From a paper:
One of these highly populated repetitive folds is the αα-solenoid (SCOP a.118), whose most widespread superfamily is the tetratricopeptide repeat (TPR; a.118.8). The ﬁrst crystal structure of a TPR domain showed that the repeat units are helical hairpins, stacked into a continuous, right-handed superhelical architecture with an inner groove that mediates the interaction with target proteins. Here we show that such hairpins are detectable and that one of them, from the ribosomal protein RPS20, can be customized to yield a TPR fold by repetition, with only a small number of point mutations that are neutral for the parent organism. We concatenated three copies of RPS20-hhta as an initial construct, connected by the TPR consensus loop sequence (DPNN).
When we studied the melting curves, M4N showed cooperative unfolding with a Tm of 77°C, while the unfolding of M2, M4E and M5 did not conform to a classical two-state transition, consistent with an unstable molten globule-like state. We obtained crystals and solved the structure of M4N to a resolution of 2.2 Å. The asymmetric unit (ASU) contains three polypeptide chains of almost identical structure (all pairwise Cα RMSD values below 1.4 Å). Notably, all three chains exhibit the desired TPR architecture with three repetitive hairpins, which interact via knobs-into-holes packing between helices Ai and B(i-1), as is characteristic of TPR hairpins. A superposition to the CTPR3 structure yields Cα RMSD values below 2.6 Å. An unexpected difference to the canonical TPR structure is that the stop helix of M4N is not resolved in any of the three chains. However, this missing helix is compensated for by a specific dimerization mode of two M4N protomers. Therein, the C-terminal TPR units of the two protomers form a tight interface, in which the B3 helix of each chain substitutes for the stop helix of the other, mimicking the capping effect of the stop helix. Analysis by mass spectrometry revealed that the M4N stop helix had been partially proteolyzed upon expression of the protein. The geometry of dimerization in M4N has not been observed in TPR structures before.
Numbering used by the authors:
A (entry chain A), C (entry chain C): 1 to 106
B (entry chain B): 1 to 105
């Protein structure tokens, strides 16, 4: 009945091994607001948890696109890309994160 | 109860934004096995979520120390450090992760 | 007609044989101790796996009403409801369970 409740429900479903249903509900949560970076990150984390790494990368990329100066999102995307063997992209986003950290340092 | 079930309870709480109690459950889970990097990382992130940045960095440093060449762990530590304004450290570990990715390539 | 007998038999039937007969003897086991939440739980699980969702939900609701402070029972009920399409009810019972988990800490 709300984004948060559908997300938590999806999480509970995932814990009990109900992968398909979990993804279904998490996708509903995203559908209520497709531009919510938090929900997108949650869905990407669920998809990655269920071995669907490419979709996870897709939604992480969208989350990045919505706010590209987000060090955390960049790092997560980079880790996912690295795990899947996409070295150049991973190093790219990690270097972006480094650049932002540098900006904060100065 | 087991480490897995404790972690599940803790995550159910963490998803609700209830970091304070979730940290209690995760502390139990970590107590059952102090060298589990998964549980250590989860506890660290929960502590950062609650607002205990330095202690989070501590547990993350332990997680790193147990398996120093792990890209995910390194990146996570880098993020936690960057959140606390410790730029040089963060960039250092991030660069370490980068070099590992490059080595794998 | 002991509970050990009935459960041994039901398990023997479900493990390799008819799910229906196993359900029969699980019903017998439940009738033996209607306040036994483990028997109700097993019955609900078997009924669910056989495709009898509403019935599973019935016995799980019964189990819940038998011990309202049981986290596992509430979680499983919420799972069955969410799987059945009842998102509001499921979210309600998840909320009860989570409230219990939280209270058990603080």
């Amino acid at each position: 009945n709300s984004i948060k409740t559908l997300s938590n429900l999806a999480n509970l479903l995932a814990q009990e091994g109900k992968a398909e249903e979990a993804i279904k509900y998490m996708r509903k949560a995203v559908s209520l607001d497709p531009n919510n970076i938090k929900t997108l990150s949650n869905l990407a984390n669920l998809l990655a948890q269920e071995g669907k790494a490419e979709e996870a990368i897709k939604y992480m990329r969208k989350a990045v696109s919505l706010d590209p100066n987000n060090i955390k999102t960049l790092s997560n995307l980079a880790v996912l890309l690295a795990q899947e063997g996409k070295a150049e992209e991973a190093i790219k986003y990690m270097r972006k994160a480094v650049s932002l950290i540098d900006k904060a340092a100065k």
